[PDB]
Amino acid sequence: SLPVLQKESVFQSGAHAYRIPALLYLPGQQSLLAFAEQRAELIVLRRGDYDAPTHQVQWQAQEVVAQARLDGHRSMNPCPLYDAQTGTLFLFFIAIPANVTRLCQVTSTDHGRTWSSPRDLTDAAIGPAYREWSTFAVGPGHCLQLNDRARSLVVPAYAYRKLHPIQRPIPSAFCFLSHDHGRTWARGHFVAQDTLECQVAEVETGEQRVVTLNARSHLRARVQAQSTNDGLDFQESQLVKKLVEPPPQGCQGSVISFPSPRSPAQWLLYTHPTHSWQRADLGAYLNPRPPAPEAWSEPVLLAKGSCAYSDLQSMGTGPDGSPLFGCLYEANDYEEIVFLMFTLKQAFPAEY
């Protein structure tokens, strides 16, 4: 139980009503948006400002994101993004009543206080391949904006491909990519088969920036792949043995990049349960030479006991002078979603 700045349940339900956390940091407002699914199935939200004087996030009352829904459909997998160029916030999500799943989004121009009517992106982003899948999803958790000239948007996703061998559809992860703030979308190529819920980050490796995709698998280790073309194509996928996956279902995990506390420009921080076969003991891992699989550190326990899905966000600089982080995760047999705020110095003291 390392020392942390804050730890509190932001969603609680004895009936396991809240699941699938998503966290988003707004750099100008210095606030967080915590999203979650509430079981029709809808997306809820709690906003909170980082109160510097007390170095605590003051969470406001829970609100339903009414706009994030299609009539007669269930809304799931909140996947938020802050567009630094326009300041607009994007909340991508899936809507479900043959493929009948829909890719949607609502936007906000007032820091997420009010949202636009839902926009169905299905046709524009998936194309003909749509009928080749049984279903699909995005995220869950925050998506990515690259530091390229266009400030491209990359949305992590996965689809159950009906390869039709009269057998169960198999999931494969991939990315949706837009260079024009969501006006147009391209669907990237799948990574290895049997990859589910993934997250993407951008880092400097060698003398170029690459997109790293870290996916859940049904194996005993995470699956990772990197792309040199913004996620359209990924090099051979590989197992990251240093990052355990509890068989046979695995578990979703979160990864983000952040400025190195020192050769490489960015480091990666990743959270996921650390137990060999159970969804327990949430740990934080560091990669100082991203995204090299062999460079991952041993994890540090953020929370002992039952823990599942999680989502991370960098939050600028913490009180002690090191990088500040926020983490939203499912805990206590899915009875709640907890918010943890800590710094790199607190979590990895050996670094300081």
Side-chain angles (χ1 to χ4, degrees):
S1 183
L2 76 177
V4 299
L5 298 178
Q6 179 177 5
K7 178 172 185 177
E8 84 177 64
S9 175
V10 288
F11 291 114
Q12 188 290 311
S13 178
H16 319 89
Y18 301 107
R19 281 210 61 192
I20 314 302
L23 189 68
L24 181 69
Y25 181 67
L26 306 182
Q29 297 295 83
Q30 285 188 52
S31 61
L32 289 168
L33 289 185
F35 298 88
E37 276 179 44
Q38 180 198 65
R39 70 178 185 185
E41 190 96 7
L42 48 71
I43 295 172
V44 294
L45 157 71
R46 289 195 70 182
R47 71 182 78 281
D49 303 326
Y50 171 63
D51 187 69
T54 59
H55 56 281
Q56 299 289 290
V57 175
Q58 297 176 169
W59 296 106
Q60 304 180 185
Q62 176 182 302
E63 287 180 352
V64 174
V65 182
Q67 294 286 58
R69 175 163 58 182
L70 299 185
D71 296 306
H73 289 67
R74 299 165 56 66
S75 291
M76 56 196 84
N77 284 49
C79 291
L81 176 172
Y82 160 75
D83 189 321
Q85 202 156 68
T86 65
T88 305
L89 306 193
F90 286 81
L91 176 65
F92 296 98
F93 66 92
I94 298 295
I96 301 174
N99 197 348
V100 301
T101 301
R102 303 261 94 189
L103 172 55
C104 305
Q105 71 161 52
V106 295
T107 44
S108 177
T109 55
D110 59 11
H111 313 302
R113 302 205 183 77
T114 66
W115 305 81
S116 68
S117 55
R119 173 184 162 193
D120 189 312
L121 307 170
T122 313
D123 293 351
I126 297 171
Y130 186 74
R131 50 198 172 189
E132 308 176 10
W133 315 335
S134 58
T135 191
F136 68 92
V138 287
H142 76 282
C143 33
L144 172 72
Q145 174 163 57
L146 309 181
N147 277 87
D148 54 352
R149 189 61 172 291
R151 297 312 293 283
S152 307
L153 311 185
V154 184
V155 178
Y158 70 94
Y160 286 96
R161 312 173 69 182
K162 299 183 302 181
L163 300 176
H164 275 170
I166 200 61
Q167 301 173 180
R168 58 180 176 183
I170 179 180
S172 291
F174 69 95
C175 289
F176 280 114
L177 168 73
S178 173
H179 299 303
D180 49 23
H181 310 285
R183 192 177 194 181
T184 59
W185 288 99
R187 178 175 61 76
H189 293 73
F190 294 113
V191 294
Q193 282 186 291
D194 233 350
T195 44
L196 316 75
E197 300 138 324
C198 69
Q199 285 206 346
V200 287
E202 182 179 55
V203 303
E204 171 194 66
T205 185
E207 305 173 300
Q208 77 177 315
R209 293 169 315 199
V210 300
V211 167
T212 184
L213 182 146
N214 192 303
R216 167 186 174 189
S217 75
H218 289 135
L219 308 178
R220 288 185 155 60
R222 298 286 289 185
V223 173
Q224 181 270 169
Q226 64 164 54
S227 171
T228 55
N229 65 353
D230 303 349
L232 241 48
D233 292 285
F234 279 93
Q235 298 178 182
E236 180 166 53
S237 315
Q238 65 187 311
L239 289 180
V240 188
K241 297 184 177 303
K242 288 177 184 292
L243 304 185
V244 71
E245 269 288 31
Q249 56 292 297
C251 185
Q252 176 273 356
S254 180
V255 63
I256 54 168
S257 67
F258 67 92
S260 168
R262 303 172 182 172
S263 188
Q266 290 85 40
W267 280 11
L268 291 175
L269 181 69
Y270 156 96
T271 52
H272 180 283
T274 64
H275 196 292
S276 292
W277 57 280
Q278 288 176 42
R279 285 182 177 185
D281 302 333
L282 187 69
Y285 304 67
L286 274 185
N287 189 324
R289 298 183 294 288
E294 63 276 3
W296 285 99
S297 73
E298 290 180 356
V300 165
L301 254 293
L302 294 182
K304 307 168 68 65
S306 177
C307 300
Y309 287 38
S310 63
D311 201 23
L312 290 162
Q313 282 293 278
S314 50
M315 300 175 64
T317 307
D320 57 32
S322 69
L324 182 63
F325 301 109
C327 178
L328 204 64
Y329 67 97
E330 308 180 315
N332 185 51
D333 197 24
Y334 309 101
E335 290 176 55
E336 65 182 2
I337 291 178
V338 178
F339 171 67
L340 187 63
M341 180 163 70
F342 60 89
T343 66
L344 186 64
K345 187 174 181 183
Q346 293 179 307
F348 296 90
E351 178 50 41
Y352 300 73

